[PDB]
Amino acid sequence: MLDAERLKHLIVTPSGAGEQNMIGMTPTVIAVHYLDETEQWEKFGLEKRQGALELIKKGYTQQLAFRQPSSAFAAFVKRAPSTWLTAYVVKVFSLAVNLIAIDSQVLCGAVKWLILEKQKPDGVFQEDAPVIHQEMIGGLRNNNEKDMALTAFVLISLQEAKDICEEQVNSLPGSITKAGDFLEANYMNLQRSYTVAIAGYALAQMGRLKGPLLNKFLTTAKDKNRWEDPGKQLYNVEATSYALLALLQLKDFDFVPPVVRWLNEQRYYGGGYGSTQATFMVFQALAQYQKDAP
Amino acid sequence: GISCGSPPPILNGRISYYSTPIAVGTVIRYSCSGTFRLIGEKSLLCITKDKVDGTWDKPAPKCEYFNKYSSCPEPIVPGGYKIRGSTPYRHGDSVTFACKTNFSMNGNKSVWCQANNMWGPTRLPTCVSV
Numbered sequence: 106m107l108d109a110e111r112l113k114h115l116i117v118t119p120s121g122a123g124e125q126n127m128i129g130m131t132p133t134v135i136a137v138h139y140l141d142e143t144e145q146w147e148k149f150g151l152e153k154r155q156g157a158l159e160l161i162k163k164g165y166t167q168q169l170a171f172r173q174p175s176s177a178f179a180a181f182v183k184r185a186p187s188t189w190l191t192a193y194v195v196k197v198f199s200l201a202v203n204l205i206a207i208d209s210q211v212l213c214g215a216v217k218w219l220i221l222e223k224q225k226p227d228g229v230f231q232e233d234a235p236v237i238h239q240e241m242i243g244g245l246r247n248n249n250e251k252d253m254a255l256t257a258f259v260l261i262s263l264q265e266a267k268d269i270c271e272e273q274v275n276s277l278p279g280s281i282t283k284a285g286d287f288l289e290a291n292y293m294n295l296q297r298s299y300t301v302a303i304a305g306y307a308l309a310q311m312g313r314l315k316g317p318l319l320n321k322f323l324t325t326a327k328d329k330n331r332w333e334d335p336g337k338q339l340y341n342v343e344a345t346s347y348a349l350l351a352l353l354q355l356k357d358f359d360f361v362p363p364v365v366r367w368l369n370e371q372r373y374y375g376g377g378y379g380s381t382q383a384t385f386m387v388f389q390a391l392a393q394y395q396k397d398a399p
Numbered sequence: 400g401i402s403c404g405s406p407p408p409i410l411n412g413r414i415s416y417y418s419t420p421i422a423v424g425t426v427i428r429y430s431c432s433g434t435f436r437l438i439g440e441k442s443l444l445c446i447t448k449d450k451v452d453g454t455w456d457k458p459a460p461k462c463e464y465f466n467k468y469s470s471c472p473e474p475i476v477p478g479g480y481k482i483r484g485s486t487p488y489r490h491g492d493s494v495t496f497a498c499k500t501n502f503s504m505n506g507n508k509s510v511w512c513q514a515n516n517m518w519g520p521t522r523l524p525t526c527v528s529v
Contacts, residue, residue, distance in 0.1 A: 141413070144433050158416050202428050202442070206417030209426045209444050269426050269442050312483055356485055395433075399467065399489070 107391065109149035111374050112136055115384070116157050119164035122180045123171030124238045127193060130164035131381050133157055134201050135388040141204070142392035162205050168194065169211060175222070176214025185234035188223045189242055189255065191215050192230070196262040199269070200389065213270040219259060220280045228283035230259040243382020244299040244340040253291050257303040260284045261347075264310045285311045292318055298332040301325045302344040306351035314355060322351070323360070330363040339383040342373060346386035353393055365394055401452065403445035407459035411435050421445050423453045431462035436491030438463050438511045439520045457507075463514045466490045471512040478502045478526030488512045498526035 115136035119129035137157050140146050146154060171178050177186035178194050195215045198207050223230050229252045239246055245254050263281055270277060288304050295301050305322045308314040314322060327333045332344040345368055352361050368387060375384035403421040406414060412435070415427040425445045431437045439460030445453045469490035474481070476496050484494030492512045498504045506524030513519040 141430075142433075202415055202426050203430060204415055206415045206421070206425050206427050208422070208424055210424045212426070268440070269444065310483070312485055354485070356487070 106143055106145075106395075107139070107369070107374060107388070109140055109143075109145040112139070113149075115375050116153070116160060118160065119167060122237075123168065123178050123190065124180050124236060124241065126164060126167050126171070127190070127197065128238065128241055128381055130161070130168065131197060131385050132375050133164065134161050134197060134204070135385050136375070137161065137204055138200060139388045139392050142395050158205060161201060165198070165201065165205060165207065169208075172211065172215075175218050176211070177218040177222075178215070179234060180237050186218075187234045187236050188219065188230055188232040189245070189258065190236050191219055192259045192262045193242075195219075195266050196258075197385070199262070199265040200385075202269070209269055209273070212266060213273040216263060216266055216270050216277065217274045219263070220274065220276050224259075224280055224283065228287035229256045230284070231255075240379040241381040243343045243379070243386070244297075244303070244336070246379075247297070247299070247336065247340075250295060250297055250300045253288065253295065253304055254297075254300050256284055256287060257300070257307040260288070260307040261303070261310070264307070281311070285313055289313060289318070293321060295321070298325050298327070298334045299336070299340055299344040302332040302348040302351070306347040306354065309351035309354035314351065319355070322348075326364075328363075328367075329360065330367045337379070338371070338373070339379055342368065342371060342383045343386045346383075346390035349390040350386075350393055353390075353397055358399060361394070365391070401447045401450070403453035403455060406443060406455060409459050409461060411462040411464075412437070412460075421453070423447050429460050434465050435462035436465045436514075438491070438513060440507075440509065458520075461520070463490070466514040469512060469514050469516055471516050471518050474510060474518050474523060476523055476526055478528075479504065479524065490514055494518075496524050501529050502526040503529065 115132040117129045117133050119126050173186055177191040179186045195212055198212050288308055292304055301322055305314055332348045333341045349364050401423045409429050412429055412431045423445050426442055428442050437460050440457050443455050446456045447453050471488045479496045479498040482495050482497050490512055493509050495509045504524055504526055507521045508524055510518040
């Protein structure tokens with residue numbers, strides 16, 4: 106269990122463009138979440154909490170200033186809206202709503218945007234304006250298998266937001282389907298552990314990771330405990346966190362602990378250049394694990 | 400603008416931190432404390448049916464203390480199939496349903512394994528012909 110004392114530096118005043126605001130918003134949001142879940146608030150000063158909620162809220166508001174008339178986000182208003190960033194924002198808010206109330210029109214508009222504008226007939230989500238801060242997108246930064254990876258990223262957001270936006274966005278169940286579709290077809294062909302992981306969780310949430318697919322996923326793990334590639338410690342942490350989440354979704358608790366172990370054993374506590382995805386995923390994953398710890 | 404009352408409290412849980420007035424279209428989630436399980440839909444939003452006073456769209460979930468020995472039977476809806484939902488059903492787990500072509504759904508689409516090995520908090524949903 107990553108110790109609250111070693112995390113102080115994740116409560117961060119969120120400043121900047123539609124990206125840096127999210128960069129600074131990410132760690133705070135996920136940290137409060139961790140402490141909430143792992144109960145560690147008394148250890149680390151109850152009164153610091155109200156403090157960070159306002160901080161989060163601040164992030165949230167500030168972000169809204171970058172929302173376009175389409176209900177999608179780019180770094181600034183002048184810029185072409187970003188498929189990834191929009192997806193990322195939804196992802197974060199969906200988690201944030203556990204802590205702060207949100208405006209569901211903001212979020213549901215964002216989703217309806219991704220669906221009707223950026224999903225292909227075949228079911229992939231297409232990126233038209235790559236995010237300036239390429240480092241924040243985690244493992245998607247790698248070119249290879251990009252359709253599949255970006256499609257997984259969006260899906261994971263749309264599922265994470267599914268339960269809020271279902272009545273408002275009438276195309277949403279269709280989209281989830283059409284994406285998961287696509288992921289099934291190309292899943293057997295994946296090369297990167299990274300992609301196997303993200304897409305895995307994407308399809309795990311969908312009860313679609315089974316038979317030879319579940320097999321591909323599990324056997325991709327190096328040492329039955331981590332999803333790695335010659336890239337970076339961070340990709341791998343990210344990749345693994347997804348994988349952990351995926352395992353939780355299948356409920357193969359019999360295979361989980363050596364994974365958690367590894368994640369725990371990384372001496373990594375969020376924060377830094379490129380850290381956004383690795384931070385958000387690893388504490389999301391780990392907390393889910395606590396909730397579900399039998 | 401149009402605005403909701405307070406959300407149901409949840410015993411042994413938490414609610415997102417908002418601040419009044421609550422505007423229409425506001426989500427809040429509910430979670431349960433470390434060793435309690437959430438039973439029932441977790442998100443609630445403020446909506447307007449009459450287009451004059453806002454009201455919350457579903458009941459609050461409630462926390463049940465986690466029973467480690469709890470398990471429910473495989474739940475079946477005549478006329479629908481289970482979409483999301485992975486067996487074995489231990490305490491707190493959920494399942495969602497869709498009706499088959501030529502069936503309308505009448506009821507809440509998801510159920511939770513209650514500590515008493517029955518599915519709640521509603522009745523299982525009903526699918527009906529056309």
